[PDB]
From a paper:
Phylogenetic analysis revealed that the IMEF cargo protein is a member of the Flp superfamily and is most closely related to Dps proteins but no known ferroxidase motifs could be detected based on the primary sequence alone. We determined the x-ray crystal structure of the IMEF cargo to a final resolution of 1.72 Å. The cargo adopts a four-helix bundle fold characteristic of other members of the Flp superfamily and forms a dimer with two Fe atoms bound at the subunit interface creating a ferroxidase site based on an alternative ferroxidase sequence motif. Through structure and sequence analysis, we identified a set of conserved residues involved in the formation of the dinuclear ferroxidase center. This IMEF ferroxidase motif differs from known examples and represents an alternative way of forming an inter-subunit ferroxidase center. Due to flexibility, the C-terminal linker and TP are not resolved in the cargo x-ray structure in accordance with observations from our cryo-EM analysis. Removal of the 13 C-terminal residues results in empty encapsulin shells confirming that the IMEF TP is necessary for cargo encapsulation. For the IMEF cargo alone, a sigmoidal ferroxidase iron oxidation curve was observed indicative of autocatalytic Fe oxidation taking place at newly formed mineral surfaces. However, assaying the IMEF cargo-loaded encapsulin results in a typical hyperbolic enzyme catalysis curve. Therefore, the IMEF cargo protein is able to enzymatically oxidize the majority of ferrous iron before uncontrolled autocatalytic mineralization can lead to bulk precipitation of iron which would likely destroy the iron storage function of the IMEF-system.
Residue numbers in the entry:
A (entry chain A), B (entry chain A): 2 to 142
Protein backbone atom coordinates (compact mmCIF):
# COMPACT_ATOMS: atom_id res chain seq x y z
CA UNK A 1 0.00 0.00 0.00
CA UNK A 2 1.37 3.34 -1.07
CA UNK A 3 -1.23 4.79 1.33
CA UNK A 4 0.41 3.21 4.35
CA UNK A 5 3.76 4.58 3.32
CA UNK A 6 2.21 8.02 2.86
CA UNK A 7 0.56 7.83 6.26
CA UNK A 8 3.85 6.76 7.79
CA UNK A 9 5.56 9.75 6.25
CA UNK A 10 2.81 12.24 7.19
CA UNK A 11 2.77 11.17 10.86
CA UNK A 12 6.53 10.98 11.13
CA UNK A 13 6.73 14.47 9.73
CA UNK A 14 4.09 15.71 12.13
CA UNK A 15 5.87 14.19 15.10
CA UNK A 16 9.03 16.08 14.18
CA UNK A 17 6.94 19.22 13.59
CA UNK A 18 5.46 18.94 17.11
CA UNK A 19 9.00 18.76 18.50
CA UNK A 20 10.07 21.90 16.61
CA UNK A 21 6.90 23.76 17.64
CA UNK A 22 7.37 22.78 21.30
CA UNK A 23 10.98 24.07 21.16
CA UNK A 24 9.56 27.33 19.86
CA UNK A 25 6.96 27.53 22.60
CA UNK A 26 9.37 26.72 25.44
CA UNK A 27 11.02 30.17 25.84
CA UNK A 28 7.65 31.87 25.40
CA UNK A 29 6.25 29.89 28.33
CA UNK A 30 9.31 30.38 30.56
CA UNK A 31 9.22 34.15 29.94
CA UNK A 32 5.44 34.61 29.90
CA UNK A 33 4.12 37.96 31.08
CA UNK A 34 1.18 37.17 33.38
CA UNK A 35 -1.07 34.25 34.20
CA UNK A 36 -3.32 34.30 31.12
CA UNK A 37 -0.51 34.31 28.57
CA UNK A 38 1.36 31.58 30.47
CA UNK A 39 -1.71 29.34 30.63
CA UNK A 40 -2.47 29.90 26.93
CA UNK A 41 0.90 28.81 25.57
CA UNK A 42 1.33 26.10 28.15
CA UNK A 43 -2.14 24.72 27.22
CA UNK A 44 -1.25 24.48 23.50
CA UNK A 45 2.03 22.85 24.49
CA UNK A 46 0.11 20.24 26.51
CA UNK A 47 -2.27 19.50 23.68
CA UNK A 48 0.63 18.83 21.33
CA UNK A 49 2.39 16.77 23.96
CA UNK A 50 -0.72 14.65 24.25
CA UNK A 51 -0.81 14.29 20.46
CA UNK A 52 2.85 13.20 20.41
CA UNK A 53 2.05 10.45 22.90
CA UNK A 54 -0.67 9.17 20.62
CA UNK A 55 1.59 9.30 17.51
CA UNK A 56 3.98 6.97 19.30
CA UNK A 57 1.14 4.44 19.24
CA UNK A 58 -0.21 5.14 15.82
CA UNK A 59 3.13 5.03 13.96
CA UNK A 60 4.06 1.54 15.24
CA UNK A 61 0.62 0.28 14.23
CA UNK A 62 1.06 1.67 10.72
CA UNK A 63 4.39 -0.17 10.78
CA UNK A 64 2.77 -3.54 11.58
CA UNK A 65 0.50 -3.08 8.57
CA UNK A 66 3.41 -2.02 6.39
CA UNK A 67 5.35 -5.13 7.42
CA UNK A 68 2.68 -7.29 5.69
CA UNK A 69 2.12 -5.22 2.50
CA UNK A 70 4.77 -6.90 0.33
CA UNK A 71 3.60 -10.46 0.75
CA UNK A 72 0.25 -8.78 -0.01
CA UNK A 73 -1.74 -11.97 0.59
CA UNK A 74 -3.37 -11.67 4.02
CA UNK A 75 -6.11 -9.18 4.75
CA UNK A 76 -5.74 -7.42 8.11
CA UNK A 77 -7.85 -8.61 10.98
CA UNK A 78 -11.09 -6.63 11.13
CA UNK A 79 -10.21 -5.77 14.74
CA UNK A 80 -6.80 -4.44 13.63
CA UNK A 81 -8.32 -2.63 10.67
CA UNK A 82 -10.81 -0.90 12.94
CA UNK A 83 -8.23 0.07 15.56
CA UNK A 84 -6.15 1.64 12.76
CA UNK A 85 -9.12 3.52 11.28
CA UNK A 86 -10.07 4.84 14.76
CA UNK A 87 -6.49 6.05 15.41
CA UNK A 88 -6.17 7.57 11.96
CA UNK A 89 -9.47 9.43 12.35
CA UNK A 90 -8.42 10.83 15.72
CA UNK A 91 -5.10 11.94 14.33
CA UNK A 92 -6.83 13.59 11.40
CA UNK A 93 -8.47 15.85 13.92
CA UNK A 94 -5.09 16.22 15.64
CA UNK A 95 -3.52 17.42 12.37
CA UNK A 96 -6.34 19.91 11.94
CA UNK A 97 -5.94 21.18 15.50
CA UNK A 98 -2.18 21.49 14.93
CA UNK A 99 -2.77 23.62 11.79
CA UNK A 100 -4.96 25.87 13.88
CA UNK A 101 -2.35 26.06 16.68
CA UNK A 102 0.22 27.13 14.07
CA UNK A 103 -2.28 29.69 12.68
CA UNK A 104 -2.78 31.05 16.21
CA UNK A 105 0.97 31.26 16.75
CA UNK A 106 1.42 33.01 13.41
CA UNK A 107 -0.69 35.86 14.84
CA UNK A 108 1.57 36.26 17.87
CA UNK A 109 5.11 35.39 16.68
CA UNK A 110 5.78 38.20 14.19
CA UNK A 111 9.56 38.10 13.77
CA UNK A 112 10.73 36.82 10.42
CA UNK A 113 12.46 33.72 11.77
CA UNK A 114 9.45 32.24 13.58
CA UNK A 115 7.09 33.30 10.80
CA UNK A 116 9.20 31.37 8.31
CA UNK A 117 9.39 28.24 10.45
CA UNK A 118 5.69 28.31 11.29
CA UNK A 119 4.69 28.72 7.65
CA UNK A 120 6.79 25.67 6.79
CA UNK A 121 5.18 23.58 9.53
CA UNK A 122 1.78 24.78 8.41
CA UNK A 123 2.35 23.86 4.79
CA UNK A 124 3.40 20.30 5.64
CA UNK A 125 0.51 19.78 8.04
CA UNK A 126 -1.99 21.16 5.49
CA UNK A 127 -0.72 18.75 2.84
CA UNK A 128 -0.79 15.86 5.29
CA UNK A 129 -4.24 16.73 6.55
CA UNK A 130 -5.71 16.97 3.05
CA UNK A 131 -4.27 13.56 2.17
CA UNK A 132 -5.50 11.92 5.36
CA UNK A 133 -8.96 13.47 5.00
CA UNK A 134 -9.36 12.36 1.37
CA UNK A 135 -8.13 8.80 1.96
CA UNK A 136 -10.26 8.21 5.05
CA UNK A 137 -13.30 9.34 3.08
CA UNK A 138 -12.32 6.99 0.24
CA UNK A 139 -12.21 4.25 2.90
CA UNK A 140 -15.87 3.32 2.95
CA UNK A 141 -15.19 0.58 0.36
CA UNK B 1 -19.13 -1.32 40.36
CA UNK B 2 -19.70 2.00 42.02
CA UNK B 3 -16.80 3.21 39.85
CA UNK B 4 -18.69 2.60 36.65
CA UNK B 5 -21.65 4.51 37.96
CA UNK B 6 -19.36 7.36 38.98
CA UNK B 7 -17.72 7.39 35.57
CA UNK B 8 -21.14 7.39 33.94
CA UNK B 9 -22.14 10.39 36.02
CA UNK B 10 -18.87 12.29 35.47
CA UNK B 11 -19.00 11.90 31.67
CA UNK B 12 -22.70 12.64 31.44
CA UNK B 13 -22.11 15.79 33.44
CA UNK B 14 -19.21 16.77 31.24
CA UNK B 15 -21.23 16.25 28.09
CA UNK B 16 -23.89 18.64 29.38
CA UNK B 17 -21.14 21.05 30.47
CA UNK B 18 -19.69 21.05 26.93
CA UNK B 19 -23.14 21.95 25.59
CA UNK B 20 -23.49 24.87 28.02
CA UNK B 21 -19.96 26.09 27.27
CA UNK B 22 -20.57 25.89 23.50
CA UNK B 23 -23.78 27.95 23.94
CA UNK B 24 -21.68 30.51 25.76
CA UNK B 25 -19.04 30.57 23.04
CA UNK B 26 -21.52 30.86 20.16
CA UNK B 27 -22.31 34.61 20.40
CA UNK B 28 -18.65 35.38 21.05
CA UNK B 29 -17.69 33.66 17.80
CA UNK B 30 -20.50 35.23 15.75
CA UNK B 31 -19.54 38.71 17.02
CA UNK B 32 -15.76 38.27 17.06
CA UNK B 33 -13.68 41.38 16.45
CA UNK B 34 -10.96 40.34 13.98
CA UNK B 35 -9.43 37.16 12.63
CA UNK B 36 -7.29 36.15 15.62
CA UNK B 37 -10.08 36.37 18.20
CA UNK B 38 -12.50 34.52 15.88
CA UNK B 39 -10.02 31.69 15.27
CA UNK B 40 -9.23 31.41 19.00
CA UNK B 41 -12.79 30.91 20.22
CA UNK B 42 -13.78 28.87 17.21
CA UNK B 43 -10.74 26.58 17.82
CA UNK B 44 -11.74 25.91 21.46
CA UNK B 45 -15.29 25.28 20.27
CA UNK B 46 -13.99 22.69 17.79
CA UNK B 47 -11.90 20.93 20.39
CA UNK B 48 -14.92 20.56 22.65
CA UNK B 49 -17.07 19.46 19.73
CA UNK B 50 -14.53 16.75 19.02
CA UNK B 51 -14.60 15.73 22.69
CA UNK B 52 -18.42 15.53 22.62
CA UNK B 53 -18.23 13.14 19.68
CA UNK B 54 -15.92 10.89 21.64
CA UNK B 55 -18.16 10.99 24.77
CA UNK B 56 -20.98 9.63 22.65
CA UNK B 57 -18.81 6.54 22.21
CA UNK B 58 -17.40 6.30 25.67
CA UNK B 59 -20.72 6.65 27.56
CA UNK B 60 -22.41 3.74 25.71
CA UNK B 61 -19.37 1.57 26.41
CA UNK B 62 -19.55 2.39 30.11
CA UNK B 63 -23.22 1.41 29.80
CA UNK B 64 -22.40 -2.05 28.39
CA UNK B 65 -20.15 -2.66 31.40
CA UNK B 66 -22.78 -1.36 33.79
CA UNK B 67 -25.37 -3.70 32.27
CA UNK B 68 -23.31 -6.69 33.55
CA UNK B 69 -22.35 -5.39 37.03
CA UNK B 70 -25.36 -6.76 38.93
CA UNK B 71 -25.04 -10.36 37.87
CA UNK B 72 -21.41 -9.67 38.85
CA UNK B 73 -20.20 -13.08 37.66
CA UNK B 74 -18.48 -12.57 34.30
CA UNK B 75 -15.22 -10.70 33.96
CA UNK B 76 -15.10 -8.34 30.97
CA UNK B 77 -13.27 -9.47 27.88
CA UNK B 78 -9.65 -8.30 28.02
CA UNK B 79 -10.24 -6.65 24.63
CA UNK B 80 -13.27 -4.78 26.02
CA UNK B 81 -11.43 -3.91 29.22
CA UNK B 82 -8.55 -2.44 27.24
CA UNK B 83 -10.79 -0.45 24.88
CA UNK B 84 -12.50 1.04 27.95
CA UNK B 85 -9.21 1.89 29.68
CA UNK B 86 -7.90 3.54 26.46
CA UNK B 87 -11.09 5.65 26.11
CA UNK B 88 -11.12 6.57 29.77
CA UNK B 89 -7.48 7.65 29.65
CA UNK B 90 -8.10 9.83 26.59
CA UNK B 91 -11.10 11.42 28.22
CA UNK B 92 -9.10 12.08 31.36
CA UNK B 93 -6.93 14.30 29.23
CA UNK B 94 -10.09 15.74 27.67
CA UNK B 95 -11.41 16.69 31.14
CA UNK B 96 -8.10 18.34 31.94
CA UNK B 97 -8.12 20.27 28.66
CA UNK B 98 -11.71 21.33 29.36
CA UNK B 99 -10.70 22.69 32.80
CA UNK B 100 -8.01 24.71 31.10
CA UNK B 101 -10.45 25.98 28.43
CA UNK B 102 -12.75 27.14 31.23
CA UNK B 103 -9.76 28.77 33.00
CA UNK B 104 -8.88 30.57 29.75
CA UNK B 105 -12.47 31.73 29.33
CA UNK B 106 -12.57 32.93 32.94
CA UNK B 107 -9.83 35.42 31.98
CA UNK B 108 -11.87 36.85 29.11
CA UNK B 109 -15.54 36.64 30.20
CA UNK B 110 -15.59 39.05 33.16
CA UNK B 111 -19.30 39.75 33.63
CA UNK B 112 -20.80 38.22 36.73
CA UNK B 113 -23.18 35.89 34.90
CA UNK B 114 -20.56 34.09 32.80
CA UNK B 115 -18.07 34.07 35.67
CA UNK B 116 -20.62 32.28 37.83
CA UNK B 117 -21.49 29.70 35.18
CA UNK B 118 -17.86 29.06 34.29
CA UNK B 119 -16.86 28.58 37.92
CA UNK B 120 -19.63 26.01 38.28
CA UNK B 121 -18.50 24.10 35.19
CA UNK B 122 -14.93 24.27 36.43
CA UNK B 123 -15.78 22.89 39.84
CA UNK B 124 -17.61 19.88 38.41
CA UNK B 125 -14.86 19.13 35.90
CA UNK B 126 -12.17 19.42 38.60
CA UNK B 127 -14.02 16.95 40.81
CA UNK B 128 -14.57 14.60 37.90
CA UNK B 129 -10.98 14.84 36.74
CA UNK B 130 -9.57 14.12 40.19
CA UNK B 131 -11.78 11.05 40.49
CA UNK B 132 -10.90 9.74 37.04
CA UNK B 133 -7.18 10.36 37.59
CA UNK B 134 -7.13 8.57 40.97
CA UNK B 135 -9.14 5.55 39.80
CA UNK B 136 -7.14 5.04 36.61
CA UNK B 137 -3.96 5.07 38.68
CA UNK B 138 -5.52 2.55 41.08
CA UNK B 139 -6.21 0.42 38.00
CA UNK B 140 -2.87 -1.31 37.70
CA UNK B 141 -4.22 -4.23 39.79
FE1 LIG C 1 -5.88 23.82 20.94
FE1 LIG D 1 -7.45 23.76 23.76
Amino acid sequence: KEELDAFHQIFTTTKEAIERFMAMLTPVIENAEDDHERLYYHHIYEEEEQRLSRLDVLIPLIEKFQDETDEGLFSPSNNAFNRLLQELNLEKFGLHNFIEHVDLALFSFTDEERQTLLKELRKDAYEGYQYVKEKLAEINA
